[PDB]
Design a protein around this ligand. Structure first.
Ligand SMILES: N[C@@H](CCCC[NH3+])C(=O)O
Ligand SMILES: N[C@@H](CCCC[NH3+])C(=O)O
Ligand SMILES: N[C@@H](CCCC[NH3+])C(=O)O
Ligand SMILES: N[C@@H](CCCC[NH3+])C(=O)O
Ligand SMILES: [Cl-]
Ligand SMILES: [Cl-]
Ligand SMILES: [Cl-]
Ligand SMILES: [Cl-]
Ligand SMILES: [V+3]
Ligand SMILES: [V+3]
Ligand SMILES: [V+3]
Lengths: 252, 251, 249, 244
């Protein structure tokens, strides 16, 4: 009921978090560019995530688009997955209002320590990626915007791959990504996830990817992309492979 | 696959459990009739559970059977669920071999503090319950056998119901179940479950049930029933194998 | 300090508590007659605790009075400890001001769910108990007043004893029936660590401290408060302020 | 009374598995440090209480206040008890084959009690500025008994830098700190920890006020462990030239 969702989520977060504990999560987010909301520290009520997982699962069964390309602006890292564009996820009233919820964005703003602005490009507001076959992966890349709340809806067993790897405190130079060079100079943090987890990712300064699936499994995530004040900046690269599969940077 | 699963499991358990921590779990088992293996205290590797889940998913879509009955031997409590009979689950080489694994049965024997014998009735070796609709429930009852390892494969949101309620330290008298009377005299322990959890249940002396679903959802579990040394079957109440058993009532 | 204690305590508590989580503490307080403020639920900043403990250490060395009698109004339960009188602790401006602090009583009122009135008897306003030898205990008893905030300033290891044992939802009678109540009810034992604070519903919770197994230091501070029901007093058993009370033995 | 190796081998067998100990070995090799706390006890609580009582040997309480030259003039401000300790309880457990056998699964190599009889060390820091300054160890292994630990807000934590080496002529202390990160290990009363004392630069943080920090060191040795150089040996001989 939108207003009832926010009123409940407010109580839900007030039952689990305090200003001191959020400040500890803010420290972790700035150190790793990543904070995980697992069974210990939940972010949304289990009934709410179920509702989100069902609305996403329906969008996959109808709108799934296979992608298998290389993105030149990220050192030609692979993008082997199925996607659901943002223009089609925006039809879901639940996912659309929740991604602009004053309660959710305000709570997470305590972790980012800066205003979270739900005003990003229409083709990037929401993204659903669905990896099914072996070698499927979201290759090393950066995000155009500052923040993204990722819903780890369905994750394979950790022995099948699919983990999130991350290198924080970097930046995206599209004219020269230096992806493999950065790995040589920095330690990689591997973040395993379990079905039901959510995590906040600082997408613009954290080089990240998903470990390829070593065997046929199912990896479904929902991405809510948000902006910071620094992102409100012209979009460059012509590398929007999730919307346009034959972008000027998408080589196959 | 095959006998390599016992070696993987023997390592999986050695990495997490010690005789001291198992003895602590054994204390909880006798106190509650219930020990939960959740995200903190896993029991089987994630890949192994996924393989068991996928085998049960297929068994459901292949040989599901709807049950909607009351059981006279358990005070006419409702059984409202779909099931897959033990005869069909035994077609799974993985599930049947894992139900008789010496390392799995051996580890759990430290929690039961007694030998776990994998010799039970052929219509009760395995069982799958599939609750899908509102008011679906596995009503108040006991187990004819002592032990049951329950795989909480798919569990609905906690706000929709489906929790295990239990009353430990009771007994099943099929001529006078005294279920509602036991509730009046004893406290009820409610056990929330999440998808992926397993739990060991002392089914003969723990009055238990699943909280009915408050809305359409999905609740899928697998039952591995084992026997103790204390375990002749009476009651004519084997409703999961025979929907028209003597004790099975209608409406 | 003085008026700085309130601004510091209000800022300290507002960062570690929400009205929703305080409600969860209020449930636990009505259930067990007891709620512990430990490393997971701090109540005062570390500086305020140090100043209170440091002040309490001086009051112990200067004016220690040992008690060792049996109280008839609590079934002849033993009271083997050293104590410091209330009028003595009232001289400390820090303890007296913190005892009436609108921020402290205001926060704790959300746990009791009723008004906490700092109007009690002059001889029972504050209390320090120091047990140093074996077989020392504050025997089974109740409280004449509703609420008491206890400062577990120095607590021995659990293996030495000194834990708080409690039976909530009782009352204090001419006929205490203490061992009978233990037979009919079951006892909650609450272990305490150095620096812990806990709120106790003293009028309805039969409570004691487990006797010391060996020589060990056990130092606490009681800040007794009252509720609306505590506004008529009897017993002739005020042993802490009068060791020659009519109930002592 | 030789009844310790039996009660210890049972105490450890029900609290550790070979795969659990292998995880402790990785932690020991990476940090040079493995702490035995409430989650991973090493001795029964009665045995430690007997050691804490036996050590409380301090009968030999000799204060120290020097600067060791082979460690860049880092301070040594504490009391000591000389290896006086060789009490039959500490001596028997130090050569206990069950204890040295289990701990060898963490070091991944055999540990030998054949060390200089100069063996056991009891540290007793009391006043402020008391510290066991930056240093290494002439021997590989040492099991430290944090018998009594002040609260963390006062100091006493162990700061360690693994994967280093001791050059008595050029200790390179502050320069090593600039190039390596410092691991701070907080300790509580009752914890024990195994320390690779030769390749781990370590120290205790100086106490911020008068407190009580009591420790017992049982220095063992390894096969790769030579000659005693530096003329340091400050815990034994207070006037050993290498002091200050
Ligand atoms: N730029 C990202 C896509 C961002 C989608 C929203 N976080 C990539 O190359 O995969
Ligand atoms: N006795 C149980 C059936 C157990 C089947 C699984 N072991 C009941 O009446 O519901
Ligand atoms: N009346 C209590 C002591 C109360 C002290 C003030 N709260 C007793 O008999 O021990
Ligand atoms: N060699 C160390 C002392 C070790 C004493 C024996 N465990 C130092 O220079 O401080
Ligand atoms: Cl991204
Ligand atoms: Cl059953
Ligand atoms: Cl009282
Ligand atoms: Cl050393
Ligand atoms: V991304
Ligand atoms: V009292
Ligand atoms: V040393």
């Amino acid at each position: 009921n939108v207003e009832q969702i926010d009123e409940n989520l407010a109580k839900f977060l007030a039952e689990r978090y305090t200003p001191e504990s959020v400040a500890q999560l803010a420290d972790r987010f700035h150190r790793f560019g990543f904070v995980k909301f697992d069974a210990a520290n939940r972010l949304v009520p289990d009934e709410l995530q179920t509702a989100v997982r069902e609305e996403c699962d329906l969008l996959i069964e109808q709108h799934k688009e296979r992608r298998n390309l290389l993105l030149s602006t990220t050192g030609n890292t692979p993008r082997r997955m199925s996607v659901v564009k943002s223009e089609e996820i925006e039809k879901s009233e639940l996912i659309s209002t929740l991604s602009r919820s004053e309660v959710l964005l305000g709570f997470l703003a305590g972790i980012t320590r800066e205003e979270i602005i739900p005003e990003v490009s229409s083709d990037e507001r929401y993204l659903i990626t669905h990896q099914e076959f072996k070698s499927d992966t979201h290759g090393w890349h950066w995000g155009d915007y500052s923040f993204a709340l990722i819903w780890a809806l369905r994750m394979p067993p950790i022995e099948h791959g699919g983990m999130l790897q991350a290198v924080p405190h970097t930046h995206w130079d599209k004219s020269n990504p230096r992806i493999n060079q950065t790995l040589c100079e920095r330690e990689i943090n591997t973040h395993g996830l379990e079905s039901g987890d959510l995590y906040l990712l600082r997408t613009d300064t954290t080089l990240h990817r998903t470990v390829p699936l070593s065997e046929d499994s199912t990896r479904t995530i929902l991405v809510m992309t948000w902006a910071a004040k620094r992102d409100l900046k012209d979009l460059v690269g012509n590398d929007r492979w999730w919307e346009n599969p034959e972008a000027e940077a998408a080589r196959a």
